[PDB]
Symmetry: D2
Subunit: 381 residues, 4 copies
């Protein structure tokens, strides 16, 4: 019994070694450059910090309305101080060839504006959800992309989150059997004192209440989990008339949907209840519980059958996939580099907007709203 | 250091000792005699086996339409063969003073008449849920109870299940804060080859589909967790038109409600997907997840807040409270012995039936139904 | 679409129906009669209540040194008052052919003599663990069983518990790979004021401390999970010198073992810390976690690998296998009826006692003790 | 009912906003500069990627023996190509004032060498665990720090991991009661083909097997969880003599310890079994289960009592504390900036080395090894 070759050949003195094994995503290059517009809560707590983990993305320039703040951040992330644009001279980015695309992290109402604006600046557009505050503005955004022959991608991080991906895969492998009932809930207690929440209370700025904000996850999720689109929709909303927070936007709203397969779904969103992100998919073989379902971190899914609960979550020492944020950034970057369509196109973001408007209409009229308008998810869910 | 008195006084030879510490409910007496009506699935799998752990209840007689089966069951539970009754000679139980009550475990359409004949026979009545198949019949049962001066109790085992009572208690202790959103789901794959499910597919016998059968748990649970009644309901139901199972009763139905406190709820029942029994109660301080929520066994609850999940379930060595079945049985017994009302009276069962009829009515018309009819829960939830 | 034959043939009036689907063990007969010896804590809290779910067992007689208590217990379980025995007139059970066996639930030092007198009385014997307080006495019990041509079974409920048998099965199916490390812990806070614990603090009656009482589960479990016997043990024990509870028996003791396969294990038992019952079995493919591992209820197992945790526990509506207590009771009954050996014979109980004596011997000398004495598990683990 | 001031004052046109709320650690400055020596598996998968999240640390220079690789990394992390040292001219760092400290991520045997070497280069030292391969080399490292009046810190990330910190806090708050039994297990299947594992198989390079490598976590953990030091130690080790992997170092080893408080602990480490990081702390009120206990990610702790399991883990949307890696880096950085002692000093790393040697001695001799040498954890655990 003797030691193996490798071990026996290791010098007992300081010596160089080969490239170590990768048990986590390693940085490769930094060829794609982003222009981030809107230094808000998401842009600073989740997005910018997300670039560090990218393999193909960098922060080349940032666009802000607050010059003093924009100066402080530029330092932290080391972006060229001379590359700190504003809303007035945002259009001038078309002069910088090192600015491949822009990432719009502005209030919902301002999405369409800077999207078509950037498209005429010859840049790729990564717009946050919800796409826009109007089906029309969504289509105009698509038109600008086509006209400029550029890429339009919506910020659906769940489309690039490991656990969410595992959930879809397991369903496509038929581990749940025939799908028949989906249940979604997304909630967070609205704080009017938080600067980021203030515009969300303004209807012309947000476009809607909790649905447009977080209920969209359940809606979108119900869609890619089931792998199909709603053909009919019904909904109801209610808000405490005495709560100053919901004068213009809805607090909570409940929507029921039917699909071509015969599958049904019921879900809700809320501005008056604590943190909730839970999805449930019922097949005739098993039931999947995603909880947390769409968190920034610590997602956890479980396939349940009588006597069993098979849970999956990110490992404790290894990282077989990149976090949703970095994976999202690089996804646009490498969709361009390889001339490939993006998984989350403007047509997909436009689909949620229509459905949401159809849902509001259903809650407004109290009648079923037909949504069987032949939409097709290009490239699968 | 020396040994304590107790240990040092134990004889080393065979000797009598004290009553031991009780770590689970001990039997006490079998003073309250039941007559079980309908030796079917729930009866033979859950109720009859549930008598063993009772502290005041016993099986005195059986009522069956299958003499061969009754004879076998009677022998299995030491019942006197002379105490076997036909559905035709049922009324003669009035002649046996050793029969204090009957437990009706027949198809839904037959609960009313046998409860009424039981009262005419001067016996107390325990009746399974759903109470009956018409509001009118529920009232006739209540009128007969009062006319005979005997008690009327509906089989809501979840009203005597330790984990459900624990969820109710943490809610009343304001551990979730102000309640805003409740979500329920109760499902099971319908198998037309199971004899018990055969009458469930007949509208005339079942009185309805998945809502009457298992959706009632979500409905009833939403009411006792919130501790209040709904003021209006909305709903929609769908069933694949080609599925032989749902020609007369509904498969899947979704109902949402609004309560006087402002709270909302969305729930669903299914005959088309596998085992699901899950309740979530969202407050503005924390979120409660009951899953399993209403199982015959293994219920599990969890209070969730960012970074935490405090779970509760039955201990592994001790049994602080009796199981739901034995408890329910003794509950009616203790109520007559002590001359007190029951927690699940006929009025409670009637309220669920009225709400279910409202829900079916709301699904049928696609319009909301006002249910603000002033039902008051006597004794609390 | 029309209704299936079954549903359409159900009468709408009161009518007899078929035997229902069984979703839990149904009673069958009570052919095997037991005489319970020692109406203490385990007997009244677990064993007597366990007879209800038996399919072939019944309580025929009681043996107690507290006539007042026996009279009460007899009435609680419908036992014939004439079937109450003294520890002095115990031998006269030989005169009752309706008594097939006895279940010895007395302090450890008294198991041997009453098992022997039981055999002399021509009865089968179920004896609680630990089998006895000396290896020699275990052999005398075995010799008496053989001399009387009656069976000898030790109360190892975990050998008939669904979750433990499920853990054994996944192990034998190589789901963990090659077994290398097993960890066990069994603890409970000793309370000298509980009558049952009083003899446990007396060396002469208990035969030892925490190892004899509950550490035996870790020991016995390590053997059936690994499916092999230890070839040597090592150990150390410690007990606060000023604590009146541990003047004669040990509080905490740690023992580690090596098996012929190469596998190792380290476990411990405690009278000083709260409820703990946890087993982990490390293989090179996956890790098994049993926690609760040996509870009277709610056992839970999980197979863990990076990114996964597949849990198993008893279902919420169905009961595939009978509870451990009822199962253990019927097991001896089926063994004599069918003329077969039991899974927990006297030899099995004797092996644990020999191993425990080796462990105490290893702790006492601080030296390792060779236990490679060729015990062979008849019938498998 | 009107909208609140904040919301109503938000311009519906592009405008600048204030600094957003922080729900996650924000980058502040980058004043402290690190010199990372040893571009291995940890340095590249966990450490370097860890700087991005720091608030006070940057990568100023890297030391490697592989020039080609060192060139590739420098690009990825953008370190000055002219600042790529090697083992020969490592000493020259003393000339760069922008190099505040060095982080040694070299094989165990080479820890002492470059530590004292860097101390004479007038730099602060952050050495990875285990400190060194000799108690003596540990003391020499301490001497160099004192002589150079610099800071010596060991890489105990668990000392700066949220969940591990929560575990200590809860124990100090007495939520477990009086501590009496700790159980630890740390395992990973050794792969001789992995370049990083090859030196670990060499005794003069690693200093020991699984204990020195990962068993140290259980040892260290047992120490800060209990908040005290071992006074006595016993151990045993075994390795398959036919396995080429363990010719020089131990595969698995089991060690038992006793503390001044009377608390006991049993734990093990393994090179032949799958991923395992589990700690268990038993008090007389509750039991704590850390599993994962010391993972790079996804740690999970739980306080258990009969009927309860209160779990804690990182939130799903917020990040109230920085990850162990970044927190570790900045900790040295800010320990210098504020002239404060470090929580993980060389004296603490030296303590584990002694205990480990004492443990090996115990396993070698098979006798108890006294470790009551008056060590004192400066600054608490
Ligand atoms: N997918 C996900 O997980 C998340 C997506 N989002 C989305 O990101 C977008 C930004 O929202 P969020 O960061 O939370 O909110 P914030 O209120 O915190 O920030 C909005 C940002 O847009 C700019 N802005 C321009 N005009 C206005 C205006 N009139 N009122 C307010 N801000 C303005 C500001 O940049 P500056 O001050 O520098 O001038 C500000 O930092 C939204 O579309 C939201 O739906 C948000 C959170 C998560
Ligand atoms: N609370 C709970 O958890 C549960 C409550 N239930 C309730 O108990 C009641 C019985 O349901 P369940 O045991 O599942 O069903 P089953 O179909 O299995 O049994 C019904 C029984 O009633 C008698 N019966 C008399 N006339 C008829 C008839 N015309 N058609 C069918 N049966 C007849 C039969 O007994 P016999 O042969 O002896 O004449 C039969 O076994 C229902 O109201 C149901 O809602 C059911 C399951 C669970
Ligand atoms: N497998 C399992 O899960 C468990 C097994 N056990 C085992 O069962 C056996 C009994 O333990 P347990 O029920 O907890 O203890 P108890 O002390 O509560 O009862 C022992 C019983 O035996 C009789 N007895 C006769 N002589 C004595 C004596 N001198 N001192 C004390 N009792 C005497 C008494 O019955 P009477 O008054 O009627 O004369 C007494 O109630 C033990 O061997 C124990 O290891 C215990 C718990 C669990
Ligand atoms: N706390 C924690 O979580 C962890 C701590 N560690 C610790 O980090 C240290 C490094 O181990 P690890 O990264 O896993 O192992 P690696 O084998 O992957 O790397 C060792 C590094 O040290 C340098 N080195 C110098 N001389 C030698 C030599 N003779 N043989 C091998 N390498 C040499 C090499 O740098 P170059 O090739 O560039 O010249 C090499 O990259 C160890 O002390 C280990 O205990 C490791 C993992 C986790």
């Amino acid at each position: 019994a003797t030691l193996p070759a490798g071990a026996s050949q290791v010098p007992t003195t300081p010596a160089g070694r080969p490239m170590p094994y990768a048990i986590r995503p390693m940085p490769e290059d930094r060829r794609f450059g982003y222009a981030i517009v809107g230094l808000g809560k998401y842009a600073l707590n989740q997005i910018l910090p997300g670039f560090a983990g990218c393999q193909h993305s960098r922060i080349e320039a940032l666009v802000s309305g607050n010059a003093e703040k924009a100066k402080i951040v530029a330092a932290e992330y080391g972006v060229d101080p001379r590359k700190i644009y504003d809303y007035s001279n945002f259009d001038k980015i078309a002069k910088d060839p090192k600015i491949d695309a822009v990432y719009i992290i502005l209030p919902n109402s301002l999405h369409a504006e800077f999207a078509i604006r950037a498209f005429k600046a010859g840049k790729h557009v990564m717009c946050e959800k919800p796409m826009a505050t109007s089906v029309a503005d969504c289509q105009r955004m698509i038109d600008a992309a086509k006209a400029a022959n550029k890429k339009l991608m919506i910020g659906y991080r769940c489309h690039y989150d490991p656990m969410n991906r595992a959930a879809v895969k397991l369903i496509r492998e038929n581990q749940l059997g025939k799908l028949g009932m989906v249940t979604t809930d997304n909630s967070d207690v609205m704080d009017q004192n938080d600067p980021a929440q203030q515009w969300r209370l303004r209807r012309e700025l947000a476009g809607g209440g909790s649905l447009m904000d977080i209920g969209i996850y359940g809606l979108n999720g119900t869609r890619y989990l089931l792998g199909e689109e709603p053909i009919e929709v019904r909904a109801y909303t209610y808000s405490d008339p005495n709560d100053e927070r919901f004068v213009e936007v809805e607090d909570r709203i409940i929507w029921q949907m039917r699909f071509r397969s015969g599958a049904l779904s019921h879900g809700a969103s809320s501005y008056s209840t604590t943190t909730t992100s839970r999805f449930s998919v019922q097949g005739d073989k098993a039931v999947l519980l995603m909880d947390p379902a769409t968190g920034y971190y610590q997602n956890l899914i479980s396939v349940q059958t009588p006597g069993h609960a098979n849970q999956s979550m990110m490992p404790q020492f290894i990282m077989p996939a990149n976090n949703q944020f970095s994976a999202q950034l690089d996804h646009l970057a490498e969709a361009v580099i390889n001339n490939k369509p993006v998984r989350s196109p403007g047509e997909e973001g436009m689909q949620d907007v229509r459905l949401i408007q159809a849902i509001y209409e259903a809650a407004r009229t109290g009648r079923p709203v037909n949504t069987d308008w032949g939409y097709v998810r290009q490239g699968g869910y």
